[PDB]
């Protein structure tokens, strides 16, 4: 059409993605399975106590430290999406320990900064590491550190209202979740129809390192880990 | 099996489509996002004003052209999904025109002409270009400026009945829309539940040039111009 | 973390899956297609005929002949996704047979045996073979010859709960499909609401083959053949 | 313009309950990007340039010196703002080329204009079409006058929910009465009341404008 087309040049660090992005595909075997989520037990958990949360620890109770809590639930239990895989040498690297590494949206674009071993954390001081790391990302002060390493890693793009989606894995990582948006959507309990609040859930995973057995069953203890977050007591 | 096996050679331009498919991938970072419409307020526009359309501009008033102007409402004001990226120099070309690209699909396969300009068109220029198109596409006439560019495209793939899927850019560009159906599907509105026709909506989107907000965002204007297309005057 | 990361090395057969893996991508052009399907007549159709089959057969009645007959059904009247694309010579390979490949999950992880020649099998015979295939899958003596070999190839990983998800394909072929489980999830039959049990079902496709008007209209196939397996005789 | 003029004047009545909604719910978000307050008023600009495009006569007007019409391709439509030292009438200019928010940036900046008198003059001067609001004050209906060189001028009469069938059945909805002067030198009534039906449509269901029909 009209040859009105500007241009700008890429300086490094923004076409650096793109070259360390394409070695996360071309690397991995990128798929993507999906599930939905009833959040309704767990926002009146943010009913209830939220006030209560906030007069003791003076943190914003979330609907997401949930999903930092019970994606570390199935993360001990199924430590295949935990691990990766070397390049250099062709040889799996397990771990005990878990790094998850969130990602909170900024101005300049988005962050992915680490809590680091969620294992021996619970269901509050995550969020203080959170509130800790949303303030430090608004003011750019995250150092490289708070976002180095990471062995899974959370999207939350529903703040924004995706229903559903495909996410990318930020690599060194085998698995990246992804939640989608709390639509009320009509809902079967029982022979019965009726509305819940519901989430749709992703889980990108390297097939090199994860079969699909080991990736729906991963996304279904975070599926009923946030239906019923009882379950996270139970080590079950 | 039955060693029966009969096969034929490709034709450099039926393979030709291979190649010039693989450097789509291997090129971009191609995700998808996915969102449902509700197509209610738009199929009565075509109840309505269907017969005046007709008599006045001659002209088959269609669900199409919305999301063809609604896919400029949004694409102007997000003008990286209008962009690209060089791949002989690393640098983003922006763009203030957009010359959609268009899918009809056809006996001898799939073309994909071009909508030029749509920024100083109307709701029903455009059906004067898509009807001179799909004339011009059941005579194998189509030209090849015709089909020649291209900064954003749309793929109705729910004339065949699609529920949802993953289009493929066709490039140089770094975006698709992609159309999947209408389908009376139970819906919430209000905590109460109803049937209403609504369609998923798909947007692949090369992850290099484009965050998962700059189309998650994208792709919810194109939603709210398509249930509500009154936000089209809004220019909002 | 905590230093303690554990590895052990890739044995060849493990990774090797890896390497012929990233040949099925970086070779076909993977795409992926959805619907949904009703599985309610076909229920009641293992609620009828459940005895009569088992005290005549002795074979145990699945939902899954069924998408393996379907998928002859489609498969022969879309011969494309029966094809392939030669890598050698650029010439694909259509075939007159089909020799599915099904997919059974098991202890050491998965195996993917052949059902030879289906187009000359009826809707229990198919049921003899994968009942003969998953005794021969549990001990382990499931040969190659077996194995080697497909055409088409259908997964199932709704047995372990899955919603949807995008599978990939095992080479040499062109397609796979794959089940998503049943889930009584609300539906709109003729204005109003109810609940029906129900499936989503995807399709993988090589792009370079398969025109998605050969991938929706092959899978609508299989979504009226299972909602009404009486087409199956009216060879429709 | 009496004596000029052969004024008429032709009635309708609109339904406004579709574009109130339109700012019941596109209200915020139209201050939030614009901060700019949705009015009813812009729609009766937008669509007294889609009906006026399309009747141009309404557009003209007729020369004195010479006897000879005027056509115009463009339209600088003349909105009046009510005011304490009276009345004014300032132009918007060229709306053909314009969205449906451009004209309430327009309109916010010509009634700050208006309080302080600093409106000039070139500002009012011109004009193919006029509006009046004669509604904020609460008329039912009424008969408007022309502030020449125009050859009409519509009027808007009040929003007062009155009863209405819609199907056989009766129901209350927010409705205006709605006027257009117009001289019959220049204006059949069939080009005056196809006119004014063209922005009772485009106002019952702004989803008019986009067809272009």
């Known amino acids: ?17 793109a070259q360390r992005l394409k070695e996360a595909q071309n690397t991995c075997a990128m798929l993507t399975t999906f599930n939905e989520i009833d959040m309704s037990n767990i926002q009146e958990m943010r009913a209830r106590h939220k006030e209560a949360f906030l007069k003791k620890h003076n943190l914003k109770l979330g609907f997401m430290s949930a999903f930092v809590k019970a994606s570390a639930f199935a993360l001990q239990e199924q430590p295949v999406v935990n691990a990766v895989i070397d ?7 397990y771990r005990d320990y878990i790094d998850i590494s969130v990602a909170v949206a900024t101005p300049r674009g988005l962050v992915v900064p680490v809590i680091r071993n969620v294992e021996a954390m619970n269901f509050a001081d995550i969020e203080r590491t ?15 550190e708070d976002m180095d390493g ?7 793009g529903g703040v924004f209202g ?6 990318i894995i930020n690599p060194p990582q085998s698995a990246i979740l992804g939640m989608h948006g709390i ?5 079967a309990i029982g022979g019965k129809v009726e509305v ?26 975070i599926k009923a880990a946030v239906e019923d977050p009882r ?6």
């Open 1 to 17: 059409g009209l040859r009105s087309e500007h241009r700008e040049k890429m300086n490094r660090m923004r076409q650096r993605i």
């Open 87 to 93: 390049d250099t040498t062709k040889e799996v690297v």
């Open 130 to 144: 959170i509130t800790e790391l949303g303030e430090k990302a608004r003011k750019n002060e995250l150092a490289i």
């Open 150 to 156: 990471g062995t899974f890693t959370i999207s939350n």
């Open 162 to 167: 995706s229903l559903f989606g495909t996410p």
């Open 183 to 187: 639509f009320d959507r009509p809902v």
């Open 196 to 221: 819940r609040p519901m989430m749709y859930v992703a889980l990108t995973y390297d097939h090199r390192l994860i079969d699909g057995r080991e990736a729906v069953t991963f996304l279904r203890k």
């Open 231 to 236: 379950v996270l007591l139970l080590d079950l």
